[PDB]
Design a protein around this ligand. Structure first.
Ligand SMILES: Cn1c(=O)c(Oc2ccccc2)cc2cnc(NC3CCOCC3)nc21
Length: 347
């Protein structure tokens, strides 16, 4: 049956959650809502509980709510954030206005771990391995994260990793000397073309390098500065990639730059495992068609001690035909309601 709910003012709003969730404590800002830590008495797990803010105030918002719910309900992988629970105090569609999402509480993110410092090679192997394991899974469902960065990567005490916030930033927050842009592939940063899944492999490259050196790979002070930093390392594009830049505007700007050759990565990453160097070179390729994929990278010699072809699963098919669908608010809200009602908890 329907559990009993109790009310409690947290942050600015009134939170109405089932009794099973106790000791609710405001933690931080999440994707499109505020998060609380709580103790789930049914499972014994410490959980993060997100209440979405105005989930149905516009078509843009309503579809976004449906999208996040659809995405979280699909993901069943060790290295990817999963949904423990989803609930509404509403007893019917007509009184349905709020959505709460529940996942595992994570200890820290990857920012806190790096902490200006170099990590050991074996720690880097393990963390990148897990990211690539989760990405293989995500990509096999034709889902792109689009915004991988250390703050989207949560790790527990055992250095066990989960990927957060996939498949979902305003112009202002991508401006200047900001971590929100430092991990973005150049084709997406400057909208060169219709982009694919390998945008995420570029991000892994930036993260891996940061874990190896303890320093941001491309700490651009703005879009242009960052592009220059990128092209100094990987070289200016050739005719081949230029043809693929469908924006006539961007292609024209690229051509104005003095041609630069690719740098030697062994001289950039001094003291690093030659196998780590090799992988970085295959990840940080300017032409996205030629980047290593997650499945391919898992088989790279650098991960020899973790790689297991029989323990690197793919996803069930993910139907995202709704993405090209135009619906009314109430229609997106009804679809969202069906998804809440039909939720079945994990083992
Ligand atoms: C920042 N964040 C989320 O945005 C988040 O989003 C949700 C997704 C689905 C349902 C509910 C919430 C969950 C989450 C869990 N755990 C930590 N742990 C943090 C502790 C403090 O260090 C950083 C990691 N963060 C989290």
């Amino acid at each position: 049956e329907r559990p009993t709910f109790y009310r409690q003012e947290l942050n600015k709003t009134i939170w109405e959650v089932p009794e099973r969730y106790q000791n609710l404590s405001p933690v931080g800002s999440g994707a499109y809502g505020s998060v609380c830590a709580a103790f789930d008495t049914k499972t014994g797990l410490r959980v993060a509980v997100k209440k979405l803010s105005r989930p149905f105030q516009s078509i843009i918002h309503a579809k976004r709510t449906y999208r996040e719910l659809r995405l979280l309900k699909h993901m069943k992988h060790e290295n990817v954030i999963g949904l423990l629970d989803v609930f509404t105090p509403a007893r019917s569609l007509e009184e349905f206005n709020d959505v709460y999402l529940v996942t595992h509480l994570m200890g820290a993110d990857l920012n806190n771990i790096v902490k200006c410092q170099k990590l050991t090679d074996d720690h880097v192997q393990f963390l990148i391995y897990q990211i690539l394991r989760g990405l293989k899974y995500i990509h096999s469902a034709d889902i792109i994260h689009r915004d991988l960065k250390p703050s989207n990567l949560a790790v527990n005490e055992d250095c066990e990793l989960k990927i957060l916030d996939f498949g979902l930033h305003t112009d202002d927050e991508m401006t200047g000397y900001v971590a929100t842009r430092w991990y973005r592939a150049p084709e997406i940063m400057l909208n060169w073309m219709h982009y694919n899944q390998t945008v995420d492999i570029w991000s892994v490259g930036c993260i891996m390098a940061e874990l190896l050196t303890g320093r941001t790979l491309f700490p651009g002070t703005d879009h242009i500065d960052q592009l220059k930093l990128i092209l100094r390392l990987v070289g200016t594009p050739g005719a081949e990639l230029l043809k693929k830049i469908s924006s006539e505007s961007a292609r024209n700007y690229i051509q104005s730059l003095t041609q630069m050759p690719k740098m030697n990565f062994a001289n950039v990453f001094i003291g690093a495992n030659p196998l780590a160097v090799d992988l970085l070179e295959k990840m940080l390729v300017l032409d996205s068609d030629k980047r290593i994929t997650a499945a391919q990278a898992l088989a790279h010699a650098y991960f020899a001690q973790y790689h297991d072809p029989d323990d690197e699963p793919v996803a069930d098919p993910y139907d995202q035909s709704f993405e090209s669908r135009d619906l009314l608010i109430d229609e997106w809200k009804s679809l969202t309601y069906d998804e809440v009602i039909s939720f079945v908890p994990p083992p």
